[PDB]
Amino acid sequence: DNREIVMKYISYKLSQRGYEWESEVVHQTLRQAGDDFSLRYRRDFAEMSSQLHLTPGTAYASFATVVEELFRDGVNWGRIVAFFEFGGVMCVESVNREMSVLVDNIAAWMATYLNDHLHTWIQDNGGWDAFVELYG
Amino acid sequence: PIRYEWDEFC
Ligand SMILES: *CC(=O)NCCNC(=O)c1ccc(C2=N[C@H](*)CS2)cc1
């Protein structure tokens, strides 16, 4: 369930900051890869979040702009982890700026993006099991 | 196309 992978990822990024908001191996491997990615690929994430200026009125377009750029010329697992971590970081930034109502909005946008643009690639490339073997 | 450092492992 794509909603549940989104909700568990976001819940985790927010709990790491002190904010409260087997399939278990997938969630666990995704948490570890995103934590790893946020340290190792600091430069790529800083470029992604550089032109954000997060407000409720611009958030949808900021998310759509970054995710369209990320996947424009293809899908791989690296970009999928980066998608979860960029969504996570937008949620953390939303709470930090007293825009916590964006968290549910971002979760919706991430679930729709997975269902409509990433589901086919995941299913054609060995599913979440291939992710766990490769990154786990 | 390699545009991000995470693309290199793929
Ligand atoms: C890390 C990863 O995704 N490994 C699985 C094998 N690689 C691919 O499935 C894959 C490689 C390269 C590409 C693209 N090249 C141009 C931009 S995306 C997609 C998938």
Author numbering:
A (entry chain A): 2 to 22, 39 to 153
B (entry chain C): 3 to 12
Give the original sentences from the paper that presented this experimental model.
The anti-apoptotic (pro-survival) proteins of the BCL-2 family include BCL-2, BCL-XL, MCL-1, BCL-w and BFL-1/A1. These proteins bind to and sequester the apoptosis effectors, as well as the apoptosis sensitizers, BIM, BID, PUMA, NOXA, BAD, BMF, HRK and BIK5,6. An elongated hydrophobic groove is thus formed along the surface of BCL-2 and BCL-XL proteins, spanning approximately 20 Å to serve as the binding site for the amphipathic α-helical BH3 domains of their pro-apoptotic partners. Herein we present cyclic peptides (CPs) with nanomolar-level binding affinities to BCL-2 or BCL-XL, and further reveal the structural and functional mechanisms of how these CPs target two proteins in a fashion that is remarkably different from traditional small-molecule inhibitors.
Notably, cp2 forms an additional electrostatic interaction with BCL-2 residue R110 through its E6 residue. Another clear conformational difference between cp1 and cp2 comes from the side-chain positions of cp1-E10 and cp2-F10. The BCL-2 residues around cp2-F10 are all hydrophobic ones (e.g. L201, Y202), which could be the reason why they trap the cp2-F10 in its downward position as compared with cp1-E10’s upward position. The side chains of two newly introduced residues cp2-I3 and cp2-E9 (corresponding to Y3 and A9 of cp1) are facing outwards, and thus may not participate in the cp2-protein interactions directly. Therefore, cp2-E6 seems one of the possible key factors for the enhanced affinity of cp2 as compared with cp1. We found that BCL-2 D111 residue can still form a hydrogen bond with the main-chain N atom of cp2-E6, just like with the N atom of cp1-G6.
